[PDB]
Write a protein that binds this ligand. Structure first.
Ligand SMILES: Nc1ncnc2c1ncn2[C@@H]1O[C@H](COP(=O)(O)OP(=O)(O)O)[C@@H](O)[C@H]1O
Length: 449
């Protein structure tokens, strides 16, 4: 397979990146087998996680060997392949599984890291210094996930010396099989964005129109712990009722500048969702509750206020399509709020982005900022799983062009259509949390000006 010829020459790093069905795995297994037939090489096949030997490439190597008719040249055991002439040897370990064993390995000439998109930073940091024999090589094959993932950073963005980087897709595969073609064509039609990621190997990256950067979010995680301040203020919760579609319902809650809960609501109708979200608000001790009223949520006001009966909890229907709040007020932090934002959705997503950016500059560049103007994610309270789902949605929120030079964002419907992603309801819920239109004191009425 001609494109791989540079892997035959000596290079410290040989990295093959591409999408599904590119032929990169078959090529590498073939080259490694042919090398083993000729040189007494010790070859480590490594991956992030190996729960059983069947997760490794040993079966692929056996098939290659059998395919080319080399069977009689080899010894084959459960977890090892050895060439009878050269004494070359394949071995197979997971990095996360037994790091200790990997560090102890000696005389390794070639390490193949397969499915390397899964390989974490700490894994590379364990693995790479163990491959220390002079002229030893590290071969890497992976299908890019995110541009910010360590593997993509390490070999594409900030690449080491002496790297042979090949980029391959199914069109570079002369024996691209029908079973994969059908699946590829089907995917190309149903979801073009997913197709380019899976089949053309394009990593997930930030649109140049995105408004919130991932590095801000990472800095913002536990920023209150990093910078040494406590949550102070009212509790605000918000609910995104989603649609009648499959998309999960959203809930977010914060205590002042510290977000404390992010939740998804699955397999609920509209009333179940409202009941779920209002119950969370009560459990979170909310002083203020908002929900998206622009769609299916427009009828939820009665159920919502009833759920709060007897409790001093403000209840506000958020309509993101409306003119911005206080639109005639001068813009801050002759130009009015109305000149700047098309609508409430943009207004409050930018309030969120601004808080996040300010926190990022505080954490990363030591620039002082009032905690009140920042936003921290309480990782422990929220849980890593929900936090990551939220972040994956926030990094996709994007600005679109506007013919009055106003700030405007792609709607949820537009995102779903163009990006092929589920509605970003966790992100919208958090956005609505940024808004506090209802004035209240323990000693007074609730006043909505
Ligand atoms: N040199 C080859 N000879 C015959 N078939 C091949 C060859 N290279 C790839 N293929 C076919 O293409 C398919 C995908 O190749 P593979 O290396 O698994 O791609 P990737 O690892 O990039 O997803 C294989 O399952 C095999 O059927």
């Amino acid at each position: 397979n001609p494109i791989f010829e540079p892997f035959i020459e000596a290079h410290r790093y040989k990295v093959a990146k591409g999408g599904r069905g590119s032929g990169k795995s078959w090529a590498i297994a073939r080259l490694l087998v042919e090398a083993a037939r000729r040189q007494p090489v010790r070859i480590l096949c490594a991956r992030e996680l190996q729960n059983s030997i069947s997760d490794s490439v040993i079966r692929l190597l056996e098939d290659t060997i059998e395919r080319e008719g080399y069977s009689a040249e080899f010894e084959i055991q459960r977890s090892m392949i050895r060439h009878l002439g050269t004494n070359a040897e394949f071995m197979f370990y997971g990095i996360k599984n037994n790091p200790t064993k990997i560090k102890s390995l000696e005389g390794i000439d070639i390490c193949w890291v397969e499915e390397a998109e899964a390989v974490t930073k700490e894994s590379w940091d364990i693995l790479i210094p163990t491959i220390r024999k002079p002229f030893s090589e590290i071969w890497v094959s992976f299908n890019p996930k995110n541009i910010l993932d360590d593997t993509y950073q390490r070999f594409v963005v900030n690449p080491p010396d002496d790297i042979c980087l090949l980029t391959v897709n199914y069109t570079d595969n002369p024996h691209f099989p029908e079973v994969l073609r059908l699946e590829m064509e089907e995917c190309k039609r149903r979801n073009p964005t997913l197709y380019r990621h899976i089949w053309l190997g394009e990593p997930v990256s930030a649109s140049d129109m995105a408004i919130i950067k991932r590095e801000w979010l990472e800095a913002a995680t536990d920023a209150h712990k990093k910078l040494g301040w406590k949550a102070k203020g009212a509790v605000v919760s918000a609910h995104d009722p989603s649609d009648t579609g499959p998309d999960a319902k959203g809930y977010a809650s914060r205590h002042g500048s510290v977000v404390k809960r992010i939740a998804e609501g699955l397999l609920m109708d509209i009333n179940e969702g409202a009941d779920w979200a209002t119950s969370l608000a009560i459990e979170d001790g909310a002083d203020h509750y908002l929900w998206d009223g622009d769609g299916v949520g427009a009828g939820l006001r009665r159920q919502t206020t009833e759920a709060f009966s007897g409790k001093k909890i403000t209840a506000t229907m958020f309509k993101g399509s409306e003119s911005p709040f206080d639109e005639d007020a001068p813009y801050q932090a002759v130009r009015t709020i109305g000149d700047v934002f098309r609508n409430k959705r943009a207004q409050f997503y930018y309030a969120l982005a601004d808080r996040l950016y300010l926190t990022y500059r505080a954490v990363v560049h030591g620039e002082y900022a009032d905690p009140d103007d920042m936003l921290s994610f309480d990782k422990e309270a929220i849980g890593e799983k929900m936090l990551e789902k939220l972040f994956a949605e926030l990094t996709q929120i994007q600005r679109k062009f506007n013919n009055n030079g106003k700030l405007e964002l792609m709607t949820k419907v537009e995102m779903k259509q163009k990006l092929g992603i589920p509605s970003p309801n966790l992100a919208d819920a958090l956005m609505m949390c940024m808004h506090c239109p209802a004035l209240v004191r323990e000693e007074t009425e609730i006043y909505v000006p």
